[PDB]
């Protein structure tokens, strides 16, 4: 069908955080390996102008200034810290369009357009017409309080969802949504 786009998750893995070798709160304690999915929305037979609105759905504890080593931003920005549920550990999130020239968008509001970033100040801006919508995902872990030594399990958490919007009413009205996931895993703290 013309509008038969279907969602697919985009996921990033706790298991890629290096060992945290250790006091200031909050502070970033490492970055996960950034991930990407070219086909978060895909499958409709008629090309469309599309955009993705990200809404985080974990508790927001506060803000921290940061500049991802990954991505190409040269200035620090404010990021919302989201509660993993594990005491002392939060995450911050950036997202971007799929292709490398689009900028990392810090998640620091209730919702934001991750691509095109122009849509945050122009409600009629969309990606150029094509058959898919993808994105890049960046996450860093944040010490929000004192951490014990040793291994810690992080549960799998849904960080939020991307809503597909379009200037084609029939596609926009479907309110297709795709999950943005933190795959759980183990981290290790070494307190010397």
Contact positions vs ligand BGC (CB under 6 A): 38, 97-99, 127, 130, 132-134
37 binds Cl ion (CB under 5 A): yes
Phi, psi angles (nearest 5°) of residue 25? -125, 135
161 binds Cl ion (CB under 5 A): no
10 binds Cl ion (CB under 5 A): yes
CB of 41 to ligand BGC, least distance (A): 8
CB of 10 to ligand BGC, least distance (A): 11
158 binds Cl ion (CB under 5 A): yes
84 binds Cl ion (CB under 5 A): no
If we measure between CA atoms, which residue out of 127, 68, 121 comes closest to residue 95?
Answer: 68
How many whole angstroms separate alpha carbon 116 and alpha carbon 125? 7
- With CB cut-offs between 5 and 8 Å by kind, which of ligand BGC, Cl ion, none does residue 183 bind? none
Can you read off the two tokens belonging to residue 54? Answer: 């990200």
38 labeled part of a ligand binding site: yes
Cβ(125)–Cβ(115) below 8 Å? no
Residue identified by tokens 């993808």 is 134
Can you read off the two tokens belonging to residue 105? Answer: 């968008």
- Detail the residues annotated as belonging to a binding site for alpha-D-galactose: 38, 99, 134
């Amino acid at each position: 069908g013309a509008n038969d786009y279907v969602p697919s998750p985009i996921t990033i893995n706790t298991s890629t955080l290096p060992v945290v070798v250790i006091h200031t709160y909050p502070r970033v304690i490492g970055e996960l390996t950034g991930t990407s999915n070219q086909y978060i929305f895909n499958g409709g037979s008629l090309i469309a102008l599309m955009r993705g609105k990200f809404t985080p759905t974990l508790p927001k504890i506060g803000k921290i200034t940061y500049n991802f080593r990954q991505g190409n931003n040269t200035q620090s920005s404010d990021f919302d810290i989201f509660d993993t549920g594990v005491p002392g550990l939060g995450i911050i999130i950036g997202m971007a369009g799929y292709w490398p020239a689009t900028p990392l968008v810090p998640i620091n509001s209730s919702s934001i357009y991750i691509d095109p970033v122009a849509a945050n100040t122009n409600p009629n801006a969309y990606n150029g017409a094509t058959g898919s919508f993808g994105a890049r995902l960046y996450v860093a872990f944040v010490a929000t309080g004192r951490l014990p030594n040793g291994y810690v399990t992080i549960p799998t958490k849904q960080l939020g969802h991307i809503l597909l919007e379009s200037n084609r009413a029939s596609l926009n009205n479907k309110r297709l949504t795709a999950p943005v996931m933190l795959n759980g895993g183990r981290i290790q703290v070494q307190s010397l």
